[PDB]
């Protein structure tokens, strides 16, 4: 409301930069921030710009100008545009002398203004033929021209979609005039500004390829890139522009004049590159590598199509490999994207003739990477994945994984290993590293090399560098298969891995490897169960990640299940006992999650687990109602009990009713939706059994009462989308296992009444659950008319549909038009379809009534839409109809 004091805004600025108090300084930023968001920002800006007492005040003013024009342009009327356009132009004139950071801002202002102003016809020409010849006005004139192509793709600047493509072809008619001005402009500090401007103009793809081919500006570009004299800043500007020119080329054949000009141009830079690597200008060596990479990317199609000839000249790849030599890893990593993309293209074409052409380069690159992966000799610990060089090593590992097919896994596996026989720890670790990355890929187990490497790694002494120990363990973990094919190496490998488990910084990696051996070699693992059991007995003593811990228990559980049936029952009991006892002692989260894993993966083929689970049942029971108030803890109990029940084979219907009964009781006081979900799992798994059907129904009816009370609260739907979803998951599971028991029950009516109600809930996943319930429920009086119970299902759907059908249809149509986003339209149409399959004459009535209740759309558009839906032969037409009709709202 109240326009801020002019003395105060300065006061704020003056405060913002210099006020001794930091907090005091801070507030000023807040006040000024709020000022920018105000309508008075426009006025205060324009005044601070013409007054211009400080450099500080102007930046705030210029920034505020820029921000106001991009964020809140709607505030300005049509006639105010010209008034601002002239004001801004005046301001950038009077302020060119000051800091460039002000001008750049102001340049973005004018640029952003021009884009949203349709009135300003030919802003590009109006700008040049007014400022071109002032010479001192050229620095900002190029600034404006530079950022204008950048702002056409600004997220913070929304100006239609059709307008955007109208902005581009306009800039095309005026492409020549700015380029000519740019040509003229060359006739150092003023070169890099010219390059950066042609750069952005290259970017939106508005420069004509043929015109630029025979252009002074394109030749001069490579000239500055050749000279060893050129500054880092100018070198950067030029490198980027060449990369911009290379990138602009969409189709190489269409742009053949420009393409060759650029192709020949960059190739002359090899000497200039070397002049830079000779010195230690890391900025330049990276710059050329960008250009070398951009070339390869632009002409990848030609290199793969016509290797060696013309634009497909393999001199290109030779240059990246030059870059791959450079000892600094930041250089080679740039071309990593291309190298992938190359191997990706090569992978598509199944021609081993094209593979053979590039195999050498790929093997040349790969050896360069193995060098790059080498650690410094003074490196003390395990190799970290979190640091720059560690992320690089991982990134290399991925690239090798993607490119290994062009070299052959086995061929490359044998190669790296033989390089060890002819070396410090650093070189050994890096080789093992790349080997570990492809160890699995070496599919044929026939070859005896793998055994050689296996025994080679396990015979490594503890004395070796802790880093070598680490990546050796990983390698062994990726060679679990070769241990299965050669079961004699089980104890030596397991022995070697147990040692690594003892060492704290090797703990995780060893735990992973043991898990992989467990999963794969579970049959042979018979002997080594006791070893696994005791380290389970003291799992928390090793410093393991939770992942590593869980994996280890999982591995133990898996090999346990393959024991003789008689021995399993006692082994499982003590494998749980460590966590069972720990539960009695006491959140139990970690202990619950550990029991889940054991139950989940202890599934013997046959029940030995029954007596065990029945005994762990009471403590799990007590642990649950103890934590009955905590959603997070009680769901991990549900999850634990879920796999506990599944762990017992046939006969597990015994432990069902005590579990179900407890679920009902705890759900009564606390309505966690995970009890609905767990219920749905029980129905899905035990619903087909006749003996469980009545118990499962009583469950649904018991769980519904608190559920309905919960949902009938104010905005109960909107406040419990998770309860809504799982409820209809539970109901859907009843439909697709034992639909008759549900339909004959009383509870089916309110469930449907809530189903109809929930169709107004905007929740995406919840809406799917209810729509699918509606569809599946109604479909019960349609599906399988050949089987006996059909006429009974027909009748029951009938009574239900008779009672609530009109509301269902009325709400369904209401939802589509006003309540929910279009994503529901298919799910509704499917339900609309199922209704017609039941009683199409009646549906016609129901739909007619719903159309008459429209709270605009003419009468004809209501009549034909009725014809469309009611006389539809495929469900597709219904959905076709809905999408069309819904559009009218």
């Amino acid at each position: 409301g109240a326009k801020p004091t002019l003395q105060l805004v300065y006061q704020a600025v003056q405060a913002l930069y210099h006020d001794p108090d930091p907090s005091g300084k801070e507030r000023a930023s807040f006040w000024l921030g709020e000022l920018q968001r105000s309508v008075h920002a426009w006025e205060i800006s324009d005044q601070l710009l013409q007054i211009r007492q400080d450099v500080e005040s102007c930046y705030f003013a210029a920034q505020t100008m820029k921000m106001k024009i991009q964020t809140s342009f709607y505030e300005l009327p049509t006639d105010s545009h010209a008034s601002l356009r002239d004001s801004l132009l005046t301001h950038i004139q009077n302020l060119k002398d000051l800091s460039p950071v002000i001008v750049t801002q102001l340049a973005l202002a004018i640029a952003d203004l021009a884009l949203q102003m349709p009135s300003w016809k030919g802003c590009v020409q109006t700008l040049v033929e007014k400022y071109s010849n002032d010479v001192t006005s050229l620095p900002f004139l190029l600034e404006i021209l530079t950022v204008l192509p950048e702002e056409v793709h600004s997220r913070s600047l929304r100006i239609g979609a059709n307008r955007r493509t109208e902005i581009i072809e306009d800039l095309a008619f005026y492409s020549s005039t700015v380029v000519s001005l740019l040509m003229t402009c060359v006739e150092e500090k003023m070169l890099m500004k010219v390059f950066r401007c042609l750069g952005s103009w290259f970017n939106l793809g508005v420069l004509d390829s043929n015109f630029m081919a025979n252009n002074k500006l394109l030749a001069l570009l490579f000239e500055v890139l050749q000279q060893d004299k050129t500054s880092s800043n100018l070198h950067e500007a030029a490198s980027d522009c060449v990369c911009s020119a290379l990138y602009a080329i969409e189709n190489v054949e269409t742009n053949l004049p420009l393409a060759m000009q650029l192709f020949q141009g960059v190739l002359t830079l090899e000497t200039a590159y070397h002049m830079a690597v000779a010195r230690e200008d890391l900025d330049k060596v990276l710059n050329y590598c960008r250009i070398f990479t951009e070339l390869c990317e632009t002409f990848l199609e030609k290199i793969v199509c016509t290797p060696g000839q013309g634009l497909g000249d393999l001199r290109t790849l030779e240059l990246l490999l030059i870059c791959a030599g450079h000892p600094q890893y930041e250089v080679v990593e740039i071309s990593f994207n291309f190298w992938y993309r190359l191997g990706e293209h090569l992978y598509k074409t199944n021609d081993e003739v094209i593979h053979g052409i590039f195999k050498a380069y790929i093997q040349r690159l790969l050896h360069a990477l193995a060098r790059h992966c080498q650690l410094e000799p003074d490196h003390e610990g395990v190799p970290e994945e979190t640091d720059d060089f560690g992320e690089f090593r991982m990134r290399v590992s991925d690239l090798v994984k993607d490119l290994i097919f062009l070299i052959g896994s086995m061929e490359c596996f044998a190669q790296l290993y033989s390089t060890l026989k002819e070396p410090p720890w650093e070189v050994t670790e890096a080789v093992l590293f790349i080997m570990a990355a492809i160890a699995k890929s070496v599919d044929p187990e026939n070859n005896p090399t793998l055994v050689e490497v296996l025994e080679g790694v396990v015979r490594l002494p503890e004395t070796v560098h802790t880093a070598v120990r680490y990546t050796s363990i990983e390698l062994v973990g990726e060679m679990s298969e070769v241990v299965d094919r050669n079961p004699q190496f089980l104890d030596p490998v397991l022995g070697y891995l147990m040692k690594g488990l003892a060492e704290k910084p090797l703990a995780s990696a060893a735990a992973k490897a043991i898990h992989n051996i467990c999963s794969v070699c579970r049959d042979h693992m018979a002997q080594h169960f006791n070893g696994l059991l005791e380290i389970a007995r003291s799992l928390d003593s090793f410093l393991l990640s939770p992942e590593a811990a869980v994996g280890l228990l999982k591995g133990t559980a898996l090999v346990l299940a393959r024991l003789p049936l008689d021995k399993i029952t006692e082994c499982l009991s003590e494998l749980c006992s460590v966590q069972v006892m720990a539960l009695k002692k006491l959140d139990p989260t970690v202990f619950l999650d550990r029991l889940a894993v054991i139950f989940r993966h202890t599934n013997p083929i046959v029940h030995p687990c029954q007596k065990v689970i029945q005994e762990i049942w009471p403590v799990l029971s007590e642990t649950l109602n103890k934590h009955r108030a905590d959603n997070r803890i009680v769901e991990r109990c549900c999850r634990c009990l879920r796999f506990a029940v599944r762990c017992v084979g046939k006969g597990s219907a015994a432990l069902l009713q005590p579990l179900v009964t407890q679920m009902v009781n705890v759900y009564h006081v606390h309505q966690h939706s995970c009890f609905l979900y767990l219920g749905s799992i029980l129905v899905d798994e035990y619903g087909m059994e006749e003996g469980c059907r009545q118990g499962l129904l009583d469950m649904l009816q018991a769980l519904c009462i608190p559920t309905f009370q919960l949902l009938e609260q104010q905005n109960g739907l909107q406040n419990h989308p998770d309860t809504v979803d799982d409820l209809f998951r539970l109901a859907t599971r009843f439909i697709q296992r034992s639909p008759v028991t549900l339909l004959r029950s009383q509870v089916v009516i309110p469930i449907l009444q809530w189903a109809i109600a929930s169709t107004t809930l905007d929740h995406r996943d919840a809406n799917c659950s209810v729509m699918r319930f509606l569809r599946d429920l109604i479909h019960t009086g349609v599906a399988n008319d050949h089987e006996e119970d059909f006429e009974l299902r027909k009748e029951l759907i009938g009574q239900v549909m008779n009672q609530l059908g009109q509301q269902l249809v009325s709400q369904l149509l209401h939802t589509c038009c006003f309540c929910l986003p279009p994503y529901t339209l298919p799910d509704v149409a499917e339900v609309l379809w199922e209704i017609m399959q039941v009683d199409r004459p009646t549906f016609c009535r129901w739909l007619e009534n719903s159309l008459k209740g429209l709270p605009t759309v003419t009468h004809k558009q209501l009549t034909d839409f009725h014809k469309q839906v009611t006389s539809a032969e495929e469900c597709k037409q219904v959905c076709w109809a809905l999408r069309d009709f819904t559009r009218l709202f």
Side-chain angles (χ1 to χ4, degrees), residues 438-543:
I438 70 183
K440 198 132 244 164
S441 65
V442 189
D443 264 316
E445 295 85 357
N446 41 11
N447 332 275
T449 322
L450 333 131
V451 170
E452 177 178 346
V453 179
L454 193 55
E455 185 196 324
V457 177
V458 299
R459 295 301 287 266
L460 290 168
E462 298 95 288
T463 61
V464 201
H465 194 292
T466 214
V468 171
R469 290 227 60 185
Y470 183 74
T471 82
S472 61
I473 292 182
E474 302 202 298
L475 218 186
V476 178
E478 290 297 83
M479 302 188 71
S480 50
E481 252 82 23
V482 85
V483 173
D484 194 32
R485 271 66 176 177
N486 293 261
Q488 71 263 13
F489 279 82
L490 192 57
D491 352 279
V493 158
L494 277 179
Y496 180 84
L497 288 184
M498 290 286 191
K499 180 55 201 69
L501 190 61
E503 271 227 57
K504 301 279 171 286
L506 267 44
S508 292
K512 272 98 177 178
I514 297 166
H515 162 246
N516 297 2
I517 303 284
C518 290
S519 171
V520 176
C521 311
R522 65 188 65 189
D523 294 341
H524 302 119
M525 210 70 55
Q527 275 272 46
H528 302 80
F529 172 70
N530 286 262
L532 282 173
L533 176 56
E534 50 191 21
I535 67 189
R537 233 75 177 259
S538 53
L539 195 71
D540 342 43
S541 69
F542 320 84
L543 285 194

Side-chain angles (χ1 to χ4, degrees), residues 557-603:
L558 285 180
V559 310
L560 164 53
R562 289 288 182 97
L563 292 179
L565 289 162
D566 44 87
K567 195 193 174 193
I568 294 181
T569 178
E570 54 172 314
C571 294
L572 172 64
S573 51
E574 44 183 350
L575 204 150
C576 304
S577 295
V578 38
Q579 275 83 28
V580 175
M581 281 161 46
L583 282 166
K584 304 179 179 179
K585 188 179 183 178
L586 204 154
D587 48 37
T589 294
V590 187
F591 305 106
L592 297 163
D593 295 7
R594 282 173 171 175
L595 278 184
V597 175
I598 301 162
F599 295 146
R600 184 184 222 246
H601 290 98
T602 315
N603 316 283

